[PDB]
Design an enzyme around this catalytic site. Structure first.
Site, PDB file in Angstrom:
ATOM      1  N   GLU A  35       0.826  -1.210   0.000  1.00 34.24           N
ATOM      2  CA  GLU A  35       0.000   0.000   0.000  1.00 34.24           C
ATOM      3  C   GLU A  35       0.860   1.260   0.000  1.00 34.24           C
ATOM      4  OE1 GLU A  35      -3.099   0.497  -0.567  1.00 34.24           O
ATOM      5  OE2 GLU A  35      -4.008  -1.488  -0.332  1.00 34.24           O
ATOM      6  N   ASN A  46      -7.532   9.429  -5.616  1.00 37.60           N
ATOM      7  CA  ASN A  46      -8.383   8.525  -6.393  1.00 37.60           C
ATOM      8  C   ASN A  46      -9.178   9.288  -7.451  1.00 37.60           C
ATOM      9  OD1 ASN A  46      -7.633   6.292  -4.667  1.00 37.60           O
ATOM     10  ND2 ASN A  46      -9.026   7.152  -3.132  1.00 37.60           N
ATOM     11  N   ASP A  48     -12.380   9.507  -7.978  1.00 40.70           N
ATOM     12  CA  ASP A  48     -13.585  10.164  -7.483  1.00 40.70           C
ATOM     13  C   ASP A  48     -13.298  11.439  -6.680  1.00 40.70           C
ATOM     14  OD1 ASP A  48     -12.555   9.016  -5.195  1.00 40.70           O
ATOM     15  OD2 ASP A  48     -14.408   8.041  -4.577  1.00 40.70           O
ATOM     16  N   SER A  50     -11.481  11.472  -3.848  1.00 37.91           N
ATOM     17  CA  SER A  50     -11.040  11.109  -2.513  1.00 37.91           C
ATOM     18  C   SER A  50      -9.522  10.896  -2.512  1.00 37.91           C
ATOM     19  CB  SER A  50     -11.766   9.853  -2.017  1.00 37.91           C
ATOM     20  OG  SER A  50     -11.594   8.775  -2.923  1.00 37.91           O
ATOM     21  N   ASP A  52      -6.232   8.647  -0.451  1.00 30.64           N
ATOM     22  CA  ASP A  52      -5.764   7.616   0.487  1.00 30.64           C
ATOM     23  C   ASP A  52      -4.548   8.098   1.292  1.00 30.64           C
ATOM     24  OD1 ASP A  52      -7.691   6.005  -0.719  1.00 30.64           O
ATOM     25  OD2 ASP A  52      -6.238   4.845  -1.872  1.00 30.64           O
ATOM     26  N   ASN A  59      -8.891   5.625   3.093  1.00 28.10           N
ATOM     27  CA  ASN A  59      -9.588   6.442   2.091  1.00 28.10           C
ATOM     28  C   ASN A  59     -10.471   7.513   2.739  1.00 28.10           C
ATOM     29  OD1 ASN A  59     -10.899   7.415  -0.195  1.00 28.10           O
ATOM     30  ND2 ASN A  59     -11.752   5.447  -0.823  1.00 28.10           N
ATOM     31  N   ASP A 101     -15.720  -4.372   9.459  1.00 23.97           N
ATOM     32  CA  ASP A 101     -16.975  -3.854   8.905  1.00 23.97           C
ATOM     33  C   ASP A 101     -17.756  -4.871   8.067  1.00 23.97           C
ATOM     34  OD1 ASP A 101     -15.808  -3.853   6.353  1.00 23.97           O
ATOM     35  OD2 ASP A 101     -16.253  -1.740   5.965  1.00 23.97           O
TER      36      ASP A 101
END
Ligand SMILES: [Cl-]
Length: 129
Positions: A35, A46, A48, A50, A52, A59, A101
């Site tokens: 990562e 990203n 969209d 957003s 990281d 994110n 989650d």
């Protein structure tokens, strides 16, 4: 801070990640390697809009606030910059919420593509833990 492999393994173990939700320590170290290359200051944007952040590339769409991702949530209740610290506490605590989650470590694209189903124990081999 750019962690060494064994240095990070020991920090993660101290913070309770070893076997957290059934994921052995090697999984977490492998995820961090691909990562962020073990760099707490890593950021990536990203498509969209957003971003990281940090050693586990958390994110801003869902998990932290960076003030520039409109209509996003802040499920970890932290500013995204807190995830860039040399102290990995905030990243780890938020990762625990993510992995709990429902989707496990599949939340991390690099883990799914590069660690899942491999010999992850090799990532902690030789370390004093
Ligand atoms: Cl799981």
């Amino acid at each position: 801070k750019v962690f060494g492999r064994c240095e990070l393994a020991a920090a993660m173990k101290r913070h309770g990640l070893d076997n957290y939700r059934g994921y052995s320590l090697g999984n977490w170290v492998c995820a961090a390697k691909f990562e962020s290359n073990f760099n707490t200051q890593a950021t990536n944007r990203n498509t969209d809009g957003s971003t990281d952040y940090g050693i586990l590339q958390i994110n801003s769409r869902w998990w932290c606030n960076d003030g520039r991702t409109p209509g996003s949530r802040n499920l970890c209740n932290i500013p995204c910059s807190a995830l860039l610290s040399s102290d990995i506490t905030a990243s780890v605590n938020c990762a625990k919420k993510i992995v709990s989650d429902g989707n496990g470590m599949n939340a991390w694209v690099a883990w799914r593509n590069r660690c899942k189903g491999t010999d992850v124990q090799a990532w902690i081999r030789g370390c004093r833990l």
